[PDB]
Design an enzyme around this catalytic site. Structure first.
Site, short mmCIF file in Angstrom:
data_model
loop_
_atom_site.label_atom_id
_atom_site.label_comp_id
_atom_site.label_asym_id
_atom_site.label_seq_id
_atom_site.Cartn_x
_atom_site.Cartn_y
_atom_site.Cartn_z
N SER A 75 -12.48 -9.22 2.01
CA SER A 75 -13.89 -8.92 1.76
C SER A 75 -14.15 -7.95 0.63
O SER A 75 -15.31 -7.68 0.34
CB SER A 75 -14.56 -8.37 3.01
OG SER A 75 -14.68 -9.37 4.01
N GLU A 86 -12.42 -19.15 4.79
CA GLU A 86 -11.14 -19.59 4.19
C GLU A 86 -10.47 -18.57 3.28
O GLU A 86 -9.30 -18.54 3.19
CB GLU A 86 -11.32 -20.92 3.45
CG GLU A 86 -11.60 -22.14 4.37
CD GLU A 86 -13.06 -22.29 4.83
OE1 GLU A 86 -13.92 -21.59 4.38
OE2 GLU A 86 -13.26 -23.16 5.71
N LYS A 98 -15.49 -0.23 -0.20
CA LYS A 98 -15.65 -1.57 0.37
C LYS A 98 -14.30 -2.01 0.91
O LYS A 98 -13.30 -2.07 0.18
CB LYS A 98 -16.13 -2.57 -0.67
CG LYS A 98 -16.23 -4.02 -0.11
CD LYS A 98 -17.48 -4.20 0.76
CE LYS A 98 -17.36 -5.39 1.68
NZ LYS A 98 -16.45 -5.15 2.84
N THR A 99 -14.27 -2.33 2.19
CA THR A 99 -13.04 -2.75 2.87
C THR A 99 -12.81 -4.26 2.81
O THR A 99 -13.69 -5.02 2.42
CB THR A 99 -13.10 -2.32 4.34
OG1 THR A 99 -14.31 -2.84 4.91
CG2 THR A 99 -13.09 -0.81 4.46
N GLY A 100 -11.62 -4.69 3.20
CA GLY A 100 -11.39 -6.10 3.51
C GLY A 100 -10.29 -6.20 4.52
O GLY A 100 -9.38 -5.36 4.53
C1 LIG Z 1 -13.56 -9.46 5.02
O1 LIG Z 1 -12.46 -8.97 4.79
C2 LIG Z 1 -14.02 -9.97 6.37
N1 LIG Z 1 -12.82 -10.31 7.14
C3 LIG Z 1 -12.87 -11.21 8.10
O2 LIG Z 1 -13.90 -11.82 8.39
C4 LIG Z 1 -11.55 -11.43 8.84
N2 LIG Z 1 -11.51 -12.80 9.39
C5 LIG Z 1 -11.38 -10.41 9.99
C6 LIG Z 1 -10.20 -9.72 10.17
C7 LIG Z 1 -10.06 -8.82 11.23
C8 LIG Z 1 -11.11 -8.59 12.11
C9 LIG Z 1 -12.30 -9.28 11.95
C10 LIG Z 1 -12.43 -10.19 10.89
C11 LIG Z 1 -14.89 -8.82 6.95
N3 LIG Z 1 -14.49 -7.54 6.34
C12 LIG Z 1 -13.61 -6.76 7.24
C13 LIG Z 1 -13.52 -5.37 6.65
O3 LIG Z 1 -14.42 -5.04 5.86
O4 LIG Z 1 -12.50 -4.70 6.89
C14 LIG Z 1 -14.21 -6.78 8.66
C15 LIG Z 1 -13.11 -6.60 9.72
C16 LIG Z 1 -15.32 -5.74 8.86
S1 LIG Z 1 -14.89 -8.50 8.75
#
Ligand SMILES: *C(=O)[C@@H](NC(=O)[C@H](N)c1ccccc1)[C@@H]1N[C@@H](C(=O)O)C(C)(C)S1
Length: 265
Positions: A42, A142, A208-210
């Site tokens: 993200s 994806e 900003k995280t991901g």
């Molecule tokens: C972006 O990195 C997004 N990630 C996801 O939707 C993953 N499928 C996910 C991983 C783990 C837990 C939940 C979802 C979003 N960005 C993340 C972040 O900013 O760290 C998130 C966990 C808030 S969802």
């Protein structure tokens, strides 16, 4: 030694860690695996919002976007609630940055437009900032799923730090749009346990995280010292050894950031 500390963290978390802090006035660049590719996850949402801001008049923020049940395909804490009402572009930007809303980001990609549901235009925006490395190929969900080593949907700590530096510190955006991006990142809700956790409270942190599969956990930030000296910090990680369901480990990023902060103090 930093490189030794970062290697120790990789062993502790069974992880691959990437770190970049660009050079400043008086500090050398900090780099660890900085030119290796890691999934954006993200983190792409920060330059995505920059691209949408750049592309349009400021009052495009007030445009109402409508969407439907079949658009909710990913974690979307804000958009889940507004299928009926729709969300303004400004609300989508806010949700994409502050809650990492996946539907919001997908809708912003569509707003940016062009091939690949906006992913080609997003990549073109990065190219305009001199980033010849990063690429976005898919949208949510994806983009978080590519196998370890695959180059799709990747950046590098080095590449994304240089992009973020231009967006927040440099002149990629005019001051009014720059302030919107900066404030959304400043008000991020998802980053307390990552770079923020590594810097003393009297340092300002915007980020900003991901987070993704294969134990992916990233954070990109701009930090300011108590006297207003800024640094850009990119930390990226994955845990291929655990396979697709490997748990992301935020503590790895908090520890890496603590080490960086110790050097920048
Ligand atoms: C972006 O990195 C997004 N990630 C996801 O939707 C993953 N499928 C996910 C991983 C783990 C837990 C939940 C979802 C979003 N960005 C993340 C972040 O900013 O760290 C998130 C966990 C808030 S969802």
């Amino acid at each position: 030694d930093l490189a030794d500390r970062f290697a120790e963290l990789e062993r502790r978390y069974d992880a691959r860690l990437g770190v970049y802090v660009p050079a400043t006035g008086t500090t050398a660049a900090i780099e660890y695996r900085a030119d290796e590719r890691f999934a954006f996850c993200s983190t792409f949402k920060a330059p995505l919002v920059a691209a949408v801001l750049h592309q349009n008049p400021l009052t495009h923020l007030d445009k109402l976007i409508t969407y439907t049940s079949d658009d909710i395909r990913s974690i979307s804490p804000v958009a889940q609630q507004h299928v009926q009402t729709g969300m303004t572009i400004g609300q989508l930007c806010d949700a994409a940055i502050r809650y990492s809303d996946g539907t919001a980001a997908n809708l912003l990609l569509a707003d940016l437009g062009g091939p690949g549901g906006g992913t080609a235009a997003f990549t073109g925006y990065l190219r305009s900032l001199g980033d010849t490395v990063s690429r976005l190929d898919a949208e949510a969900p994806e983009l978080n799923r590519d196998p370890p080593g695959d180059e799709r949907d990747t950046t590098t700590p080095h590449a994304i730090a240089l992009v973020l530096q231009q967006l927040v510190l440099g002149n990629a955006l005019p001051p009014d749009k720059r302030a919107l991006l900066t404030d959304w990142m400043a008000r991020n809700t998802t980053g307390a346990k990552r770079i923020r956790a590594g810097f003393p409270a009297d340092w300002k942190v915007i980020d900003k995280t991901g987070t993704g599969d294969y134990g992916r956990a990233n954070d990109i930030a701009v930090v300011w010292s108590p006297t207003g000296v800024p640094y850009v910090v990119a930390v990226m990680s994955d845990r291929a050894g655990g396979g697709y369901d490997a748990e992301p480990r935020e503590a790895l990023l908090a520890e890496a950031a603590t080490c960086v902060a110790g050097v920048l103090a």
